[PDB]
């Protein structure tokens with residue numbers, strides 16, 4: 001898919017998590033986020049289309065999705081163990097990565 | 107190792123997983139599959155030898171391996187906790203990732 | 213960051229792990245190693261500056277950090293289980309990835 005729909009998926013499944021009731025709900029939301037953050041890593045954002053694929057920005061752009069993916073991995077295991085409040089707090093720390101990427105490349 | 111060898115390692119250890127006697131067997135095969143799926147990401151597939159390494163096709167190629175590695179991560183954790191038939195069930199689902207990539211790039 | 217600083221983060225935290233007593237230290241050192249190996253992945257080492265970003269050596273350089281990241285993953289899960297010494301044993305095998313890369317690209 002393209003960047004905006006992947007971003008949609010991230011944002012909407014982030015909303016599920018923040019209001020989610022049970023571990024199951026968080027786990028399936030984080031599973032869809034992980035899929036969207038992977039798909040998104042193959043995209044060239046409008047701000048860097050005229051920048052090289054091997055430029056420091058594209059690498060840092062792609063790097064940011066590696067950070068997000070690993071943070072989603074952490075939240076996901078906590079949700080799998082049932083620690084629902086602990087996975088949500090971790091989703092809360094996720095948002096800093098989101099906002100850090102927008103500041104730079106959106 | 108080139109693509110074909112990495113594919114052979116994946117094929118073999120999937121077969122080990124489905125005929126596996128114990129969680130330990132599942133765990134060692136999925137580890138081999140993790141190493142192979144990471145190694146295969148370095149290659150250009152024959153169907154794309156004449157495409158840019160920055161083309162949408164090559165990104166989706168490599169992306170296919172990120173999906174597989176994470177599916178392997180999930181099955182790996184299931185086998186690490188002894189859920190031998192839960193790792194088998196999920197190993198069944200990652201076959202879909204194999205077939206989809208073959209359909210597109212083999 | 214630049215490679216040399218990320219390498220310092222890897223080396224210093226690897227020490228913490230080898231001398232640490234409780235899982236909490238190992239866990240937080242492995243998390244800093246995760247970020248370092250992820251950020252180092254952006255770099256181009258002095259040995260390969262004469263080489264295509266798409267060269268086999270460069271793919272193999274970045275592959276090396278994917279292996280390291282995934283070995284950190286397993287070590288980290290062992291620390292999170294409070295298995296401090298199991299985690300230290302896996303850090304001992306992590307080192308082989310460091311030296312191999314050094315031998316090839318440093």
Ligand code: HEC
Nearest residue numbers: 003004007010011014045061064065068097098101105106
């Ligand atoms: C870089 C690595 C990013 C990370 C990490 C996250 N986002 Fe993102 N976001 C990014 C870009 C480059 C853009 C703009 C792309 C474009 O084509 O306009 C966005 C945009 C969004 C949007 C807007 C959707 C739209 O219709 O324009 C949303 C709702 C959004 N981002 C959400 C979001 C969330 C919830 C994230 C973390 C969980 C997140 N983004 C991370 C780049 C990056």
Ligand code: HEC
Nearest residue numbers: 109110113116117151167170171174203204207208211212
């Ligand atoms: C793309 C992202 C792939 C995924 C995921 C998987 N495979 Fe694959 N496979 C792919 C290509 C491009 C090729 C052709 C390689 C070539 O050089 O011709 C293959 C090939 C195979 C083979 C044949 C190997 C041989 O001896 O020629 C096998 C047995 C195979 N693939 C198995 C396999 C399995 C079991 C997978 C998931 C567990 C899997 N592949 C994923 C591309 C991709």
Ligand code: HEC
Nearest residue numbers: 215216219222223226257273276277280309310313317318
């Ligand atoms: C490639 C995939 C590497 C892996 C894996 C590891 N290291 Fe590394 N290291 C690498 C390079 C290319 C270099 C040279 C960097 C430069 O610009 O000079 C290094 C260097 C180091 C250093 C020296 C840092 C300095 O002050 O010059 C240290 C202390 C170091 N590396 C440690 C280290 C450890 C502990 C690793 C595993 C835990 C490891 N490295 C992995 C490339 C690669």
Ligand SMILES: [Cl-]
Nearest residue numbers: 041042043062
């Ligand atoms: Cl890209």
Ligand SMILES: [Cl-]
Nearest residue numbers: 076077080180
């Ligand atoms: Cl999980």
Ligand SMILES: [Cl-]
Nearest residue numbers: 137140141282
């Ligand atoms: Cl491995």
Ligand SMILES: [Cl-]
Nearest residue numbers: 042165168169
């Ligand atoms: Cl990619």
Ligand SMILES: [Cl-]
Nearest residue numbers: 067070246247
């Ligand atoms: Cl991190």
Ligand SMILES: [Cl-]
Nearest residue numbers: 147271274275
């Ligand atoms: Cl790579």
Ligand code: NA
Nearest residue numbers: 060064100101
């Ligand atoms: Na970033």
Ligand code: NA
Nearest residue numbers: 110111113114
């Ligand atoms: Na063959």
Ligand code: NA
Nearest residue numbers: 108109110111
């Ligand atoms: Na061969």
Ligand code: NA
Nearest residue numbers: 202205206209
């Ligand atoms: Na199909």
Ligand code: NA
Nearest residue numbers: 253254255256
């Ligand atoms: Na790099």
Ligand code: NI
Nearest residue numbers: 077179285289
């Ligand atoms: Ni894990």
